From Swiss-Prot, chain B:
Family designation: Belongs to the SKP1 family.
Protein name per the record: S-phase kinase-associated protein 1
Residue(s) carrying Phosphothreonine: 117
Pfam families named among the record's database cross-references: Skp1 (PF01466), Skp1_POZ (PF03931)
Region (Interaction with the F-box domain of F-box proteins): 90-146
Domain of life: Eukaryota
Pathway the protein takes part in: Protein modification; protein ubiquitination
Encoding gene, per UniProt annotation: SKP1
Function: Essential component of the SCF (SKP1-CUL1-F-box protein) ubiquitin ligase complex, which mediates the ubiquitination of proteins involved in cell cycle progression, signal transduction and transcription. In the SCF complex, serves as an adapter that links the F-box protein to CUL1. The functional specificity of the SCF complex depends on the F-box protein as substrate recognition component. SCF(BTRC) and SCF(FBXW11) direct ubiquitination of CTNNB1 and participate in Wnt signaling. SCF(FBXW11) directs ubiquitination of phosphorylated NFKBIA.
Quaternary organization: Interacts with KDM2B, forming heterodimers. The KDM2B-SKP1 heterodimeric complex interacts with the PCGF1-BCORL heterodimeric complex to form a homotetrameric polycomb repression complex 1 (PRC1.1). Component of multiple SCF (SKP1-CUL1-F-box) E3 ubiquitin-protein ligase complexes formed of CUL1, SKP1, RBX1 and a variable F-box domain-containing protein as substrate-specific subunit. Component of the SCF(FBXW11) complex containing FBXW11. Component of the SCF(SKP2) complex containing SKP2, in which it interacts directly with SKP1, SKP2 and RBX1.
Length: 164, 146
């Protein structure tokens, strides 16, 4: 009629927890401080997936900061150890580089292009690349003169500059 | 082939070696002295539990990612015991270092945790909720996404 794990070695409680998936670990993680520490074990799925989740929220925000030319905010998020070159299906194969470009955020795009290694021809899940979007931007009359200049500079950067 | 173990109760169990050697602990002991007579004490097991683990090891003498649903039918029936007994089997599994038993018992406890509410979890295992509402709500919110 009292605590069952109370007299169990922590090693073997973890092993029992190793059979549980994140949803369940979450539930038992809130029975007490004891199980809170143990279910959030570095080696278990709750801690692991919670990272990809934290990373995912941060990615979304980075996308917005980039698109709105908010360079200082992009720098803040980047300072939290995120790799903006790394994309996948969940993120529609888009990058904050492509975000900046669509948002006319050419300073931010220059920042990202220079500061990180991006594939400028890599199409997202809408079929768009940094180059292709920048180029379609250039063919567009609604784009002001100095904008269309900042762009050519970028196209030339991505097409002609060194790599590695 | 036969040897005998003594529980903490004082009671003596005579078992074939093959079976007994499934406890790595026991297996180690036999090297640390004459292998192959005279009983060997197991101070951290009572006879009720010991009797049980003898059953388990016999049934398994032959044999050869983490899924909780593949416990053989025999073991599920074997582990149809009270929670007291279940945790003493785990401790025995530890003490005697029988990996197979350790798994199924642990798995059995894990399935007890599956599909439950934090409070039902506590009600099942007599876990005293010590979290203040504020700090509990915090892990609650912290674990939104599942």
């Amino acid at each position: 009629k009292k605590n069952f794990f109370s007299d169990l070695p922590e090693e073997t409680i973890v092993n029992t927890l190793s059979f549980l998936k994140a949803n369940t670990l979450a539930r038992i993680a809130q029975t007490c401080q004891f199980f809170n520490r143990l279910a959030n074990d570095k080696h278990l799925e709750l801690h692991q997936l919670r990272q990809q989740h934290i990373k995912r929220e941060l990615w979304g925000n980075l996308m917005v900061a980039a698109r709105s030319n908010n360079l200082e905010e992009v720098k803040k998020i980047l300072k939290k150890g995120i790799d903006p070159t790394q994309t996948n299906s969940y993120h529609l194969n888009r990058t904050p580089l492509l975000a900046a470009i669509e948002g006319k955020a050419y300073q931010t795009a220059n920042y990202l292009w220079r500061k990180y290694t991006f594939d400028p021809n890599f199409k997202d899940n809408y079929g768009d690349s940094p180059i292709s979007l920048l180029k379609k931007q250039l063919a567009n009359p609604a784009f002001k003169d100095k904008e269309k200049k900042q762009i050519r500079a970028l196209i030339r950067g991505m097409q002609e500059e060194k790599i590695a | 082939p036969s040897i005998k173990l003594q529980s903490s109760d004082g009671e003596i169990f005579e078992v074939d070696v093959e079976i007994a050697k499934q406890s790595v602990t026991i297996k180690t002991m036999l090297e640390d002295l004459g292998m192959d007579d005279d009983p060997v004490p197991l101070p951290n097991v009572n006879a009720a539990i010991l009797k049980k683990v003898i059953q388990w090891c016999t049934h398994h003498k032959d044999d050869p990612e983490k899924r909780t649903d593949d416990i053989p039918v025999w073991d599920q029936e074997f582990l149809k015991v009270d929670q007291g007994t279940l945790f003493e089997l785990i401790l025995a599994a530890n003490y005697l270092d029988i990996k197979g038993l350790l798994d199924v018992t642990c798995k059995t406890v894990a399935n007890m945790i599956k599909g439950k509410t934090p409070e039902e979890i506590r009600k099942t295992f007599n876990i005293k909720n010590d979290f203040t509402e504020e700090e509990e709500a915090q892990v609650r919110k912290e674990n939104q996404w599942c």
